[PDB]
Symmetry: C2
Subunit: 301 residues, 2 copies
């Protein structure tokens, strides 16, 4: 019983974190086998970032200008190359703490854990979701760049995010582990801005099933609705439209609570139009959307 | 930027989690050097927890009856004893992943990270607080017993909680690592229930200071209050009485922001009596109470771990 914003255990990732320094700029790198991955803008100064040319900058660097450090110990860089917005550094020794891993690109609406680091040292872990506009609402002070986001399935770490930038509104932007940005952002100081965000409807519905599972059910009602009718209301409140695929995905939770998906949709429709009237659900006075259906099933069953 | 509730990196604790089994009863244990700690009620298999004389069952149990598992490896139990509500198992191997650690008993209101575990394997990590009524609002399923709560200071792991049980309201009760329960609770089948709880005033104030530190300061006003007048109001909203000791604890955040504690109390008084008017504080619609003053300093000034 109970329900918490829960992160994956971060141990397997902790053992891969390192420090990468170029002149006066230091950030975090990810050390897997004999390769260290970090954001390429490690080779920039605060002034280089106005309009950097990374090809220009990188050619003026040698293996020797990169200072990589695992805790106290320096690692010898014997190769370097760029892969999109990532720098790859080869080191002359392999990380024995390297876990079973893959690099995955996630979709908006999906969640993952972040291991915030500074100077190659793990500081904290938290769970978040990839907003529909491709930003993350993160907790990232300066020097956190290079920190990674991940999921764990069985004994395998799926890396899905590396932190690169903070945007004018205070939200965060980054890449997958191939250096490709989520969203239309770039690694330079531009007036770039995130699109208007939306509420992840599928996740809200999952969260309401979690509430019902934990005994919170005042918001339920006798009505049912059609998908079309629900979408017309949801979209008026800046909620993502719901699809049949998304209804199908809520199936197990529906079965577990014996509340039909379209009945739960009718409940949400009423909450949207009426408000909560000070009341709370699972302790919150607003509808939460950073839990996926699988997250709910995992925690509640 | 951005502000979020964060757990400590759990790696150093993951390396200490094992599986402890007696008969059909399996739960989690904490493996430090050559000792494994787990809830004593693991010997109840699948025995009614009505009125068991743990002493007796324990005197009857053999070393070979405990199945301890660390990964694919079965640890050989070579000794066993009881320490209050905990079982201590001596094994033939000192845990190679033992970090620097200490056992501490925490105060109500204090926060910690919990590594939820099942069958000895870590499944998830979250941050929570010891409620004033001596329970935690955790997230636990069956088989989570033995999961631990902890803080990390530099390179030292301070273990402060081991999970024992769930109460009728869905909240949770457990012990420190000496095996002494938080609250009046016991590890047997009884009519025990959580008492009425309160909002951790010290933490809300710390959180308001965090907001200001982060440039979120709309709720500040130009008035002040006495401690007594603050308590008269706040206690009507089910807040814990604030003491002079709490006021002093907030001192460093008061100094950093230049806002006297009683001045911040007046803003909170105004927030309680008037609501927020749909506005947010640190992106939150409710007054957060699971961040301590030290949590705020740590996250805003610094801070990493070895």
């Amino acid at each position: 019983s109970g329900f918490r914003k829960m992160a994956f255990p971060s141990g397997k990732v902790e053992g891969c974190m390192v420090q990468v320094t170029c002149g006066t700029t230091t950030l975090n790198g990810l050390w897997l086998d004999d390769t260290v991955y970090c954001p390429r803008h490690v080779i920039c100064t605060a002034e280089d970032m106005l309009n950097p040319n990374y090809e220009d900058l990188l050619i003026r660097k040698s293996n020797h200008s990169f200072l990589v450090q695992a805790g106290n110990v320096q690692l010898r860089v014997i190769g370097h190359s760029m892969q999109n917005c990532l720098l790859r550094l080869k080191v002359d020794t392999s990380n024995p703490k390297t876990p079973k891993y893959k690099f995955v690109r996630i979709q908006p609406g999906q969640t993952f854990s972040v291991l915030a680091c500074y100077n190659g040292s793990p500081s904290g872990v938290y769970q978040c979701a990839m907003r529909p506009n491709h930003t993350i609402k993160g907790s990232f002070l300066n020097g956190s760049c290079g920190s990674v986001g991940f999921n764990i399935d069985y004994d395998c770490v799926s890396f899905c995010y590396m932190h690169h930038m903070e945007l004018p509104t205070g939200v965060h932007a980054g890449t997958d582990l191939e250096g490709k940005f989520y969203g239309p952002f770039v690694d330079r100081q531009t007036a770039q801005a995130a699109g208007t965000d939306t509420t992840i409807t599928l996740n809200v519905l999952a969260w309401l099933y979690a509430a019902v599972i934990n005994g919170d059910r005042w918001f339920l009602n006798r009505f049912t609705t059609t998908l079309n009718d629900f979408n017309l209301v949801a979209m008026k409140y800046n909620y993502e439209p719901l699809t049949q695929d998304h209804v199908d995905i809520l199936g197990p939770l529906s079965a577990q609570t014996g509340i039909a998906v379209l009945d739960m949709c009718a409940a949400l429709k009423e909450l949207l139009q009426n408000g909560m009237n000070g009341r709370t659900i699972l302790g919150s006075t607003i509808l939460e959307d950073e839990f996926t259906p699988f997250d709910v099933v995992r925690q509640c069953s």
